[PDB]
């Protein structure tokens, strides 16, 4: 009656599936992408950062951004009705309200997209392993775009929805946090690089040890949800990799559980690292190497080489990256090499 | 099935959005002339929070 005629209209067959979770997903994903495109086309960063970051100014694709709000805004939600915008659209664009528009819609659209995977797996009747694998980009998005700036002073220290702004975010985290020395980050690099290696090896050895190679290959019935994972011999690939590498998979199910498990654990570990760096609990200094470098000045390792390069990043990027602090650094306090 | 009701009026409206200069006034982007004022070299950063809607237009009478 009331509820059922809506429920089988939503779960009807169509071009796209628009379930009950499509009501959450399609406005939120649409307004996140629309906010990012109208921010990179028209909206500037001149009053929050002091930067020119739009196609209206002259920036290309690699240089536009929808920039973070200014540091004086705090962790304000920057609603358009607001205490800061007061209904005004132009000031809400100039204060950085489009950043909070894209980030809150990114949050609710990722919620709706992981709900749509549950909805699609529920009517097909499969186990929702794709929705569990998508809990790692949701963890990365919440730990980087939500938990990290909420542990900091304001939304200013947050990635600013652009290519060069994300490169600034990477170089900031090397300089101020020593983020490559964090072990949770090292697990993240291990997960992503090993997941790329896993999918390269796996696609290289399915297409090599096929059942029907090229001669009598009468094409059998292909099923879309099988993912063509029934066109190779697990015996032949196991017999190869037991001789080349020594260890090998003996399962078509544990292989793909390992293929799920490796980069999702990598992204979850790096999310735990950024959640620690939200309160500046960073793995910056080994204490024994600090005392052993302060003891004798002839003790140089690659670690003490790296701490000086981080000091160079900090004191040379900080008067322009954080302009609200009004850093006046003369030339004689900047860390140079011959000093 | 054949769909050509209004394609180039949208392209001409988008050309006239930034050609006449409306988008600087809507989205608050400065012109290449109106970046700094006639006398100051300081950047008009948004300072303290709830005066911010005043603070930007405090810069926008300096031009």
């Amino acid at each position: 009656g009331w509820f059922d005629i809506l429920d089988d209209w939503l779960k009807r067959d169509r071009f796209v599936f628009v379930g009950w979770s499509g009501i959450l997903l399609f406005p939120c994903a649409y307004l996140a992408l629309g906010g990012w495109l109208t921010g990179t086309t028209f909206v500037t960063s001149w009053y929050t950062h002091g930067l020119a970051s739009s196609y209206l100014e002259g920036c290309n694709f690699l240089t536009v951004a929808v920039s973070t709000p200014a540091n004086s805004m705090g962790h304000s939600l920057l609603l358009l009705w607001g205490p800061e915008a007061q209904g005004d659209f132009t000031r809400w664009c100039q204060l950085g309200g489009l950043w909070t528009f894209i980030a809150l819609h990114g949050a609710f659209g990722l919620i709706g997209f992981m709900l749509r995977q549950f909805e699609i797996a529920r009517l097909v009747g499969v186990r929702p392993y794709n929705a569990i694998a998508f809990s790692a980009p949701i963890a990365v998005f919440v730990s980087v775009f939500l938990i990290y700036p909420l542990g900091q002073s304001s939304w200013f220290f947050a990635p600013s929805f652009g290519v060069a702004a994300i490169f600034r975010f990477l170089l900031f985290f090397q300089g101020f946090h020593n983020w490559t020395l964090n072990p949770f980050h090292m697990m993240g690099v291990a997960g992503v690089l090993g997941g790329a290696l896993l999918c390269a090896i796996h696609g290289a050895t399915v297409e090599n040890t096929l059942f029907q190679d090229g001669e009598g290959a009468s094409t059998f019935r292909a099923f879309n949800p099988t993912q063509a994972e029934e066109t190779y011999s697990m015996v032949t690939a196991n017999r190869f990799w037991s001789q080349i590498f020594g260890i090998a998979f003996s399962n078509k199910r544990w292989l793909h559980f390992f293929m799920l498990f490796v980069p999702v654990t990598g992204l979850w570990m790096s999310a735990i690292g950024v959640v620690g760096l939200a309160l500046n609990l960073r793995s910056y200094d080994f204490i024994s190497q600090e005392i052993r470098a302060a003891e004798d000045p002839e003790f140089e390792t690659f670690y003490t080489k790296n701490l000086l390069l981080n000091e160079g990043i900090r004191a040379w990027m900080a008067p322009q990256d954080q302009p609200h602090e009004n850093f006046v650094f003369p030339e004689e306090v900047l860390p140079r090499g011959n000093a | 099935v054949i769909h050509s009701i209004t394609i180039p009026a949208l392209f001409i409206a988008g050309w006239l959005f930034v050609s006449t200069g409306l988008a600087y006034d809507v989205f608050g982007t400065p012109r290449p002339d109106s970046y700094y004022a006639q006398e100051q070299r300081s950047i008009p950063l948004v300072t303290d929070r709830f005066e911010a809607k005043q603070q930007v237009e405090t810069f926008l009478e300096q031009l």
Binding site: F15, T38, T41, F42 | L10, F11, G14, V18
Partner: peptide, 28 residues
């Protein structure tokens, strides 16, 4: 219908924004 809302949400602001970006090339 089912095809009209994808046009009115995607193809109208893409043609508008391509007009904006193609007129940005003759600024300054």
């Amino acid at each position: 219908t089912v095809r009209w809302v994808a046009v009115h949400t995607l193809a109208v602001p893409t043609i508008f924004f391509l007009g904006a970006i193609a007129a940005m090339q003759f600024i300054q």
